[PDB]
Design a protein around this nucleic acid. Sequence first.
RNA 1: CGUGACUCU
RNA 2: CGUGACUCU
Lengths: 127, 130
Amino acid sequence: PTAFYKAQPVIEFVCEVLDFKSIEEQQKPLTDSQRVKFTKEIKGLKVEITHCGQMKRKYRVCNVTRRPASHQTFPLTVECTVAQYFKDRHKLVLRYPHLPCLQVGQEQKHTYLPLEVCNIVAGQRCI
Amino acid sequence: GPTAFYKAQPVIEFVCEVLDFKSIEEQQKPLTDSQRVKFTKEIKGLKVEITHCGQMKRKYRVCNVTRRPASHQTFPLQTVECTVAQYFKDRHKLVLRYPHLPCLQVGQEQKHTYLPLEVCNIVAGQRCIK
RNA sequence: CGUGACUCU
RNA sequence: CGUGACUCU
């Protein structure tokens, strides 16, 4: 019988996946086990971003990063952390630097989005 | 004014509301100029999505309503002018149910894209502005 | 629906 | 319940 994921912040989504009532029950990085579990649930879902104003760009998740936003880097040739880049480009100080990022789009484009700036898009079937 | 959004609904139903019909069957002939001008004023600038392509629910934004009904409106088909109704029967296997109603013109005008009303839905979430 | 774009990460 | 676009017409 068809059911659709509730449209909601990805932070709340990972709480429900990992069985916290609040995200504060996780004030450290995910274990590998928790990452794998989360990845299995969110991979293939669309999310939309929240940090660029009314430009709510939509992406599909292809992976969850193995590093917290505070340590995950991408070739910016130099390297920048995601948490830093979101400081240096969008002037947002990540509230959850220790949680990983969603990788979206084509893998080669190394687009990482903090869980913080993503909402689950409405209307997608939960199987 | 306070934000409101148009109901997502088939454009045929939308046009019955604009023209105060309860049923489109009340309009068995082409629109008059005045009926067309009233309709146009309401749908112009709204996004629609089409229904004649399976799950490819392609969206376009309305820029005008054609003067001629789909049975008589034409565009350059690769070159020869072809009626909209004829093209839809040939390409889409769709014999129009309301060939006597006009088309929405959509997108950039130069592309001469005309859509029969019956293949269009008003897209949800569009502001209705006083 | 899907995807590309809004110089992104 | 941002804009634009293709798979048109």
